[PDB]
Structure 1
Amino acid sequence: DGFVRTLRARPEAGGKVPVFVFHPAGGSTVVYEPLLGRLPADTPMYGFERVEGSIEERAQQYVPKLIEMQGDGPYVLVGWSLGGVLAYACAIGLRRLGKDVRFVGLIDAVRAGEEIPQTKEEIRKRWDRYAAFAEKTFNVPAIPYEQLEELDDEGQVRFVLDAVSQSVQIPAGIIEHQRTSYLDNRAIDTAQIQPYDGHVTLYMADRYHDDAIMFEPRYAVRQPDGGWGEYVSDLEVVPIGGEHIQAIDEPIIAKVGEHMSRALGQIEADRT
């Protein structure tokens, strides 16, 4: 257990190369079950669930466990949403330690069409935007920008949540789910992408959904390479259409699965 979920266990010895999937923003790796059904028979799959920190800090926890599980390789890393960024971060980490990474699968992990500033001004604009939505959906003051600007994202939400309780009474499970979903989404926004010299496959939908765009309008635009071209020279794009939220489910996941199954077979053949 821990932060590793077994979706399909590998046999005691040998077997096919396992697929490592990484959780999405505000979700668990159970979302990869439809993908699992579209991969070849007896393909093992292990899901890495949420841990805390920057993307690099999260990868620092994941990579040692990956090596514990798969040693030298070969590594197949896959992720939808935040999971894609996490898969990529692990690939960089693993390659840096001399491991054999043969497949990185990004399921619509698309960068915003315009870069997202990590500035104090952007912090002010973000919470101004959030406040306005809050006014409308809850039918309800000055924003203490100076205190917010000094905090990181976790500090920011903690500050806002604390201030809210001072009336206001929100059940813990709803708060915590909104909190982790928010922070996971911000982790995508603030990811500092490093270059990777291996093969990356990007399954690309048409667009982000409306709710995502409301939160950060810069996601209203996608570049053809999904923003990965400058960091990845060996990049393949597999268009799948539909929306970001649909990309992980049937029927669209069948397209992803058919393509990905072809990649896995070549890996199994090259081993033999």
Structure 2
Amino acid sequence: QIDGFVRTLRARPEAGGKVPVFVFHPAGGSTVVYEPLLGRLPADTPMYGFERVEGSIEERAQQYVPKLIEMQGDGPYVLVGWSLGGVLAYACAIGLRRLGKDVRFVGLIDAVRAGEEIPQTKEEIRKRWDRYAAFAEKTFNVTIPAIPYEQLEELDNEGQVRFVLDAVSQSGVQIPAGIIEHQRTSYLDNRAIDTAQIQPYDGHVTLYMADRYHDDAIMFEPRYAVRQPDGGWGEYVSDLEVVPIGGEHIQAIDEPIIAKVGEHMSRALGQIEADR
């Protein structure tokens, strides 16, 4: 059930069968989080999960898309993700369409863009790490020394993190590798979103929309405290459907809220099977 970065959540028959749902991992998690959604989809709906790969969002899609095509040929494609996973599903939809494939459904499970753009500037890096340092001070009750802004503002997100980690390790702090790697990859995967070069998509997108981001997302990036009515997708997607689901972002992937997603999604899938 594991093949490279592809997890089989429910296998498709040797030949024929219903259209698979492809799900994409959230930052800091695997596609096992889609098991509740799977329970609320029609019986025998196949489901395959795409796990983490490296690079910009575009570079990640460039590794996913050939695999998608190896598995599902010309389509139809049903692409679904929560959080980062929604952004990844979209980037794959864009890629698949350029190659002429048939993309029938893109499900964004509260993959809501920050309500203001995140500036890609040296000033914002300075401000960001000033905030992070102030939070570190209250939490671990230490006094943080002068941040070396000159070094930090010249680095990309992965460079910034590597620098801060090296400083932390230098400072004498010993942290178990699993915790570091989980924190580091979650952080960088969520930051990857900020520079996703988002393209218009000519098909149907469903955005399942919670009420708000949870506090930790806002502490990660304060601009997530604001949401636009189209979740930031309205300019790029002509055929955008929004389905309000309530709750917080972190609740959207679980029961009971996931039942509302699965019920609507089940109807979309049903229509796809009829149109076959």
Q: Give the secondary-structure state (helix, strand or coil) at the position aligned to 1:233.
A: strand
Q: Give the secondary-structure state (helix, strand or coil) at the position aligned to 2:238.
A: coil
Q: Give the secondary-structure state (helix, strand or coil) at the position aligned to 1:178.
A: helix
Query: How does the TM-score come out when normalised to structure 2?
Result: 0.97
Question: 1:133 matched to which residue of 2?
Answer: 135
After superposition, the C-alpha distances for 1:222-258 in whole angstroms (9 at most, x for unaligned) are 1111010011111000000011000000000000000
Measure, in 1, the Cα distance between the counterparts of 2:188 and 2:220: 13
Q: Give the secondary-structure state (helix, strand or coil) at the position aligned to 2:270.
A: helix
Q: Give the secondary-structure state (helix, strand or coil) at the position aligned to 2:69.
A: helix
Q: Which runs of 5+ in 2 are unaligned?
A: none
Measure, in 2, the Cα distance between the counterparts of 1:188 and 1:12: 36
Measure, in 1, the Cα distance between the counterparts of 2:219 and 2:155: 23
Of the candidates 104, 121, 126, which is equivalent to residue 119 of structure 1? 121
Instruction: State the shift of 1:151 in Å.
Output: 1.1
Instruction: State the shift of 1:268 in Å.
Output: 0.5
Residue-pair matches, total: 271
After superposition, the C-alpha distances for 1:3-60 in whole angstroms (9 at most, x for unaligned) are 0000000000000000000000111000000000000000000000000000000000
Instruction: State the shift of 1:148 in Å.
Output: 1.1
Question: 2:263 matched to which residue of 1?
Answer: 258
Measure, in 2, the Cα distance between the counterparts of 1:210 and 1:182: 15
After superposition, the C-alpha distances for 1:186-233 in whole angstroms (9 at most, x for unaligned) are 012332211111100000000000111122111111111101001111
Measure, in 2, the Cα distance between the counterparts of 1:24 and 1:218: 19
Measure, in 1, the Cα distance between the counterparts of 2:237 and 2:252: 22
Percent identity over the alignment? Answer: 100
Q: Which runs of 5+ in 1 are unaligned?
A: none
Measure, in 2, the Cα distance between the counterparts of 1:86 and 1:72: 19
Runs of 4+ deviating beyond 3 Å: none
Measure, in 2, the Cα distance between the counterparts of 1:8 and 1:191: 30
Measure, in 1, the Cα distance between the counterparts of 2:258 and 2:53: 26
Measure, in 1, the Cα distance between the counterparts of 2:220 and 2:34: 25
Of the candidates 18, 21, 33, which is equivalent to residue 19 of structure 1? 21
Instruction: State the shift of 1:185 in Å.
Output: 1.2
